Design a protein around this ligand. Structure first.
Ligand code: KBU
Ligand code: KBU
Lengths: 264, 263
């Protein structure tokens, strides 16, 4: 992978692996999400990081608040996908990382994603607005003119997500993370929550439809010793669902989301 | 990746990814196992396949009976690992696939693995000795002189594994596969069973030791709707005996052993 000529974005190519594909012999949305994470990490590494000198001193970290992915064509096993990523501040609220996925051969856009990140103290887990000293350290690595993966006016990435009310139409109960679900800091990988959301989609949908859009809000972290219930209700040729992940016991919310599926 | 000059083995390089590493910032044994599977698949693709024309007509498939992996150094995040793989028949019993892992920069061997595969009818799940017409179709893609990743006679890869007796010293119960654990044919990926075996190793061991050897026998498949219990007892460097079995009736799906060395 490499930073582009202007040094304000990063591009990397990936060959889709045999264990990365589903029943259609195309990459799953979890493989795509893992590739977005990888290109994000390689981008931070290329520019010197993803915490700054001031963030490490203050025990501050970036945490995902929302992930929004739209896939037009999932890459097939053996195909090469090219992914371009960049960051931009949104004032003191936080930062946005965007991605564009392309077919390496045709140059056609096959997907796009956006994520909203907030600053949080690693120890107290208390959120905070981005300081000016921290903001200044990041500004030189972001484009100054707005560059959005989702420029559209009434676009899906910014829609508010309601809370699913019991009884859910479908559920998957007792989901727990294993060591493979953890990252290098022993925290549950963000992509695991996407998998858990999709566990409560009925098999018939997975067999007849393809996942087009997924928007996920992250409210609370699942600890290594927590157990999760995944709930889904149909809200709708296109099927739409409302999703809720909550702790098995008291029902504390960890995530909420929506998916849009189109007939194959 | 590419077939080597003689066309009898296959080599491919991999850059270790951020989500592929554990707390030591080095690749997990499940990432290694996924990479072995990937290089095996690319090898079959490069030579025309993973079944032959005759196997497809008779509804026959290759299935793993045993996996044995030995890692000396796990590759760090961002490092390049080179893996070479080849196959060899073992008479009509089945076939063996071997692998050698190397540090791309130093050329030093960092790991090795061997697996034993048997032929099975995919519908009836009945085992079968290979035959002659099927054997002949494969022979031209294998070396003729023996080439073993574990040459030593009566080495760790060939040791018989006993059945763990209750009560187990440690256990992880209620393990179930999710869609990410399935392969392209909707069967549980073989690497998932490695993860499930390791779930019952105590955290203290994972924190103070590194996994050096893992041998796993595959007796029965976990179906998409099955629930598994992972059992472990210390038999000792630390060594453990492992058993995976269905949550209800306790039908055995896998047995194995691990060897761990102090960090
Ligand atoms: Cl990791 C990284 C690379 C470039 C720009 C960034 N802004 C916030 N984090 C960034
Ligand atoms: Cl897939 C594959 C490649 C080369 C040799 C083989 N023998 C059995 N299967 C093989």
């Amino acid at each position: 992978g490499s930073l582009t000529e202007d040094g304000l974005s990063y591009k990397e190519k990936f060959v889709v692996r045999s264990y990365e594909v589903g029943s259609n012999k195309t990459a799953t949305v979890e493989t795509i999400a893992n590739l977005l994470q990888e290109v994000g990490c390689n981008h931070a590494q290329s520019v010197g990081f993803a915490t700054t000198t001031t963030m490490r001193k203050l025990h501050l970290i970036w945490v995902t608040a929302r992930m929004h992915i739209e896939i037009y064509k999932y890459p097939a096993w053996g195909d090469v996908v090219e992914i371009e990523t960049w960051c931009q501040s949104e004032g003191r609220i936080g930062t946005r990382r965007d991605w564009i996925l392309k077919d390496s051969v045709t140059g056609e856009v096959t997907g796009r994603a956006t994520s909203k990140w907030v600053m949080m103290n690693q120890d107290t887990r208390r959120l905070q607005k981005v300081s000016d000293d921290v903001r200044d350290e990041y500004l030189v690595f972001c484009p100054q003119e707005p560059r959005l993966a989702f420029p559209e006016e009434n676009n899906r990435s910014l829609k508010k997500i309601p809370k699913l009310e019991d009884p859910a139409q479908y559920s998957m109960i007792g989901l727990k993370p294993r060591r493979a679900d953890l990252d290098m800091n022993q925290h549950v990988n963000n992509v695991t929550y996407i998998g858990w959301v999709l566990e409560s989609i009925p098999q018939e949908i997975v067999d007849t439809h393809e996942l087009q859009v997924i928007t996920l809000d992250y409210r609370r972290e699942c600890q290594q010793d927590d157990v999760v219930d995944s709930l889904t209700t149909t809200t709708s040729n296109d099927s739409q669902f409302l999703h809720l992940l909550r702790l098995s016991g008291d029902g504390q919310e960890i995530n909420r989301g929506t998916t849009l599926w189109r007939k194959k």
